[PDB]
Design a protein around this ligand. Structure first.
Ligand SMILES: O=C1N2c3ccccc3C[C@H]2CC1(F)F
Ligand SMILES: *[C@@H]1O[C@H](CO)[C@@H](O)[C@H](O)[C@H]1NC(C)=O
Length: 353
């Protein structure tokens, strides 16, 4: 179990002004730290944030958070469930800022909600330094869905934080799961990701990585929420996990797979989507992209089951670790992208059971 700690700096808040926090399981005698960013969509104006506050309040408030959570998948401390990093110090950072972890805005008499995702990450890191993070050799900032996009937006800022706090020896790395989206045309008010993100950044006072901001410049920072555009600007090593037919991608593309027969137009659309993902990952050396219709991987208890070209994700991550030791490795690959063109053409895809 991971134990809740609310942030001692109570200026760093969830949407409703309640303090943000993190869940921690320490592992003494490990110098590895895993900081996982929860996902869960976002909201981008008063009305849809109000709706979220009614029926998704744990994603906007710590008022009702339990005092413990069970680590699962890459957050599990059992080798049987987590072959990769079972002995690491484990941190789960709840997503309660609804801003894809980009916000730097307080609740005030101008702002009904606080959007502090970028500041929550920095404050968690700061308070962990006194809990043992000061002794770390590797800090892996991981995340799923909106949390995976959050990794891309924040991994280099965590690296700069630690460098400026005087810890240049801590190697910061990113693991972005299911956060690599395409600003493609839809198959056919509440949205095209580009337009919703555009509005969100203004509403959240969202921040993006500096090099990416300098490329796209004022008014165009929404571009930096799309992995294939922000990744090449990053300096920290980032491992990208993305289903080729991601369910959230299909949802924002207005594809609703019904079990009904798939007509030619939709078949071509889905095949072209998988081809475009594959293309965006061609020059991503550390990646795991199975040809499945699914969403999120790394905190699922059966995350060990999926394989690409016979290599599981825990193995690929272990190979990544080896590759960052101070030339490719025989039989221990890090770039694993399916080439087959239809969901579940890979037999190891999740069953949905
Ligand atoms: O994280 C998520 N999304 C996101 C983030 C940045 C850019 C585009 C998107 C799509 C949306 C789906 C989500 F809610 F799963
Ligand atoms: C609390 O966090 C805010 C936002 O990052 C920061 O400006 C402030 O200095 C912090 N307070 C303390 C006591 O560290």
């Amino acid at each position: 179990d991971l134990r809740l700690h609310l942030l001692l700096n109570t200026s760093v808040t969830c949407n409703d002004g309640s303090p943000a926090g993190y869940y921690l399981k320490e592992s003494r005698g490990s110098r590895r730290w895993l900081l996982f960013l929860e996902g869960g969509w976002y909201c981008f104006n008063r009305e849809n944030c109000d709706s979220r506050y009614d029926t998704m309040r744990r994603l906007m408030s710590s008022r009702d958070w339990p005092r413990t959570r069970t680590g699962t998948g890459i957050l599990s401390s059992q080798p049987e469930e987590n072959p990769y990093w079972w002995n690491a110090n484990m941190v789960f950072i709840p997503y309660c800022s609804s801003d894809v972890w980009s916000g730097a805005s307080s609740k005030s008499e101008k702002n009904e909600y606080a959007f502090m995702g970028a500041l929550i990450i920095q404050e968690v890191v700061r308070e962990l330094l006194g809990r043992g993070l000061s002794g770390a050799k590797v800090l892996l900032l991981a995340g799923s869905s909106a949390g995976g996009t959050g990794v891309l937006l924040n991994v280099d800022r965590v690296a700069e934080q630690l460098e400026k706090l005087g810890y240049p020896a801590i190697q910061v790395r990113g693991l972005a799961d299911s956060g690599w989206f395409l600003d493609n045309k839809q198959y056919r008010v509440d949205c095209a990701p580009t337009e919703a993100i555009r509005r969100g950044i203004r509403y959240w006072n969202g921040v993006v990585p500096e090099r990416c901001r300098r490329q796209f410049q004022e008014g165009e920072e929404w571009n930096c929420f799309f992995g294939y555009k922000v990744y090449p600007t990053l300096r920290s090593p980032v491992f990208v996990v993305q289903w080729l037919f991601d369910e959230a991608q299909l949802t924002v593309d207005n594809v609703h797979l019904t079990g009904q027969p798939v007509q030619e137009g939709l078949r071509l659309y889905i095949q072209n989507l998988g081809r475009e993902l594959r293309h965006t990952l061609k020059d991503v050396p550390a990646s795991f992209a199975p040809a499945c219709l699914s969403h999120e991987i790394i905190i699922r208890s059966h995350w060990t089951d999926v394989q690409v070209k016979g290599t599981s994700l825990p193995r690929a991550l272990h190979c990544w670790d080896r590759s960052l030791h101070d030339t490719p490795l025989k039989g221990c690959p890090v770039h694993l992208v399916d080439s087959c063109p239809w969901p579940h053409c890979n037999p190891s895809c999740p069953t949905g059971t």
